C-alpha cells in the first residue's frame, strides 16, 4: 500500500479547468489483486481544511482503458492525478506531497523519476 499527502481537486468537462480547491488530506492506494483488472482502490480522505468542496471519502476502482494519466491537464497546475471516467466516477486528486514542497509543479513532483514509476505501476498495470 502506497500513501502520499494529496488534496481533492475539481474535475471539469467544460474546458478541463483542473486547479485545486486546496484542502489537505491523503490518498491511500491499495494495489488489490481482485481479478484480471486489478481494481486498485484510490481512497481519498480529508484530515483538515473543510474550505471549498471537501468531498466525503469515496473509493474509486481502476477500470483499465478509460482512465488516463497526463501530468498536467491544462498546465495551470501540475501533479494532476487522473482518473478519467467522463463524469461517472470522475473525481480528481492533486498530489500535495513533500518533494521540494507541497506546491504545484509541472511534470509531476521534483523527485521526477520516483513518481513516474508509481503512475505506471498503479494505473497502467492490472494485477
Amino acid at each position: 500500500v502506497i500513501k502520499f499527502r494529496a488534496g481533492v481537486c475539481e474535475y471539469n468537462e467544460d474546458s478541463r479547468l483542473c486547479t485545486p480547491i486546496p484542502v489537505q488530506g491523503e490518498i491511500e492506494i491499495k494495489p488489490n489483486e481482485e481479478e484480471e483488472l486489478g481494481f486498485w482502490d484510490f481512497e481519498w480522505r480529508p484530515t483538515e481544511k473543510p474550505v471549498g468542496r471537501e468531498l466525503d471519502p469515496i473509493s474509486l476502482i481502476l477500470i483499465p482503458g478509460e482512465t488516463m494519466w497526463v501530468p498536467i491537464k491544462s498546465s495551470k497546475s501540475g501533479r494532476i492525478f487522473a482518473l478519467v471516467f467522463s463524469s461517472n466516477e470522475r473525481y480528481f486528486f492533486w498530489l500535495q506531497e513533500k518533494n521540494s514542497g507541497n506546491l504545484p509543479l509541472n511534470e509531476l513532483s521534483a523527485k521526477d523519476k520516483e513518481i513516474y514509476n508509481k503512475m505506471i505501476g498503479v494505473l497502467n498495470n492490472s494485477s
Partner: protein, 131 residues
C-alpha cells in the same frame, strides 16, 4: 609500537660488527658461488621505517604581511578570519556581483544575479533536505 620494532633490527647489526669485518670477505664470494637473496647489488640490507603520524605547520616568515598582496582564490562558504574580509572582492567574471559595495566584513551578503536563468548548483539549507 612502530619505534619498538624499528630500533630492534638496527641495534643487532651494529653489535655484530667486530666479528663481521673478516666474515664479510668470505661472504662476498659465497653469494656469487651459491645464490642470492633477490638482489645482485652489493649486499644491501634492511633499514626499517619509523612511525611519524603528525604533519606539523611551520610559522610565518612575514609578519608585516600575513596576507601578502598576491591573489589567491577563496571559495564562497569557507572559514573567513576578519583579516581576509578586507581584501575580499567579488569578481565580475561571475554572474554574481554585490548589490551595493561589499562591507569589508564577514556576514550574510546578498548579490544581484545577472543570469539566474542559467543552471548553477545551489547549496541546500538543512531545512530544504528534510522536505
Amino acid at each position: 609500537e612502530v619505534e619498538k620494532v624499528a630500533t630492534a633490527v638496527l641495534s643487532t647489526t651494529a653489535r655484530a660488527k667486530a666479528r663481521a669485518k673478516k666474515t664479510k670477505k668470505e661472504k662476498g664470494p659465497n653469494e656469487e658461488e651459491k645464490k642470492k637473496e633477490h638482489e645482485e647489488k652489493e649486499k644491501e640490507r634492511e633499514t626499517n621505517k619509523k612511525g611519524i603520524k603528525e604533519t606539523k605547520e611551520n610559522d610565518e616568515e612575514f609578519y608585516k604581511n600575513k596576507y601578502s598582496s598576491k591573489p589567491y582564490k577563496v571559495d564562497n562558504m569557507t572559514r573567513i578570519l576578519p583579516q581576509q574580509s578586507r581584501y575580499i572582492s567579488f569578481i565580475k567574471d561571475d554572474r554574481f556581483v554585490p548589490v551595493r559595495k561589499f562591507k569589508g566584513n564577514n556576514g550574510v551578503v546578498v548579490l544581484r544575479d545577472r543570469e539566474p536563468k542559467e543552471p548553477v548548483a545551489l547549496i541546500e539549507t538543512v531545512r530544504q533536505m528534510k522536505d
